[PDB]
Design a protein around this ligand. Sequence first.
Ligand SMILES: COc1ccccc1CC(=O)N1C[C@@H](C(N)=O)CC[C@@H]1C
Ligand SMILES: COc1ccccc1CC(=O)N1C[C@@H](C(N)=O)CC[C@@H]1C
Ligand SMILES: [Zn+2]
Length: 140
Amino acid sequence: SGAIYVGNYRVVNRHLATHNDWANLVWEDSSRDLLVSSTTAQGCDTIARCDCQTGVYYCSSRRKHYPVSFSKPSLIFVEASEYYPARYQSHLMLAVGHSEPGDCGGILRCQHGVVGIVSTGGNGLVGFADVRDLLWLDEE
Ligand SMILES: COc1ccccc1CC(=O)N1C[C@@H](C(N)=O)CC[C@@H]1C
Ligand SMILES: COc1ccccc1CC(=O)N1C[C@@H](C(N)=O)CC[C@@H]1C
Ligand SMILES: [Zn+2]
């Protein structure tokens, strides 16, 4: 679990969105595993606007913050699950690092701010949904 709080937006994995999130929907994209809902309180996060390939992410299944090198956002095939059939997930970045299904929502940060959130994983791999291209999160 986990979410990003920027201005009056809450960014969550779409598969973990609540019914309140859906009632207050701003934007969602199933192919990205993202959903953004509106908030009443202002959050304390800043979104990175950069092409960084290094950073640190939080791993709940280890209670640890790990430094990582990660790939560029791309279309990556993700196996079928209880939330989606097998498909290409877009804007995904992979890294060698520990993850388990419950780690989704863990934030990845670089020196410029929030880069994305854990969305996928594998045997010694972790995948992050990028948020740096969503320029509108910084305004309106
Ligand atoms: C001190 O946190 C970090 C430091 C470096 C890099 C990453 C983090 C994680 C982070 O930003 N978290 C943990 C977070 C989560 N959902 O992963 C809950 C809220 C909070 C905003
Ligand atoms: C962090 O996730 C894992 C880590 C290790 C092993 C397996 C997983 C699970 C995983 O990849 N997904 C993909 C996710 C999606 N974005 O389509 C929905 C289902 C499930 C939460
Ligand atoms: Zn950066």
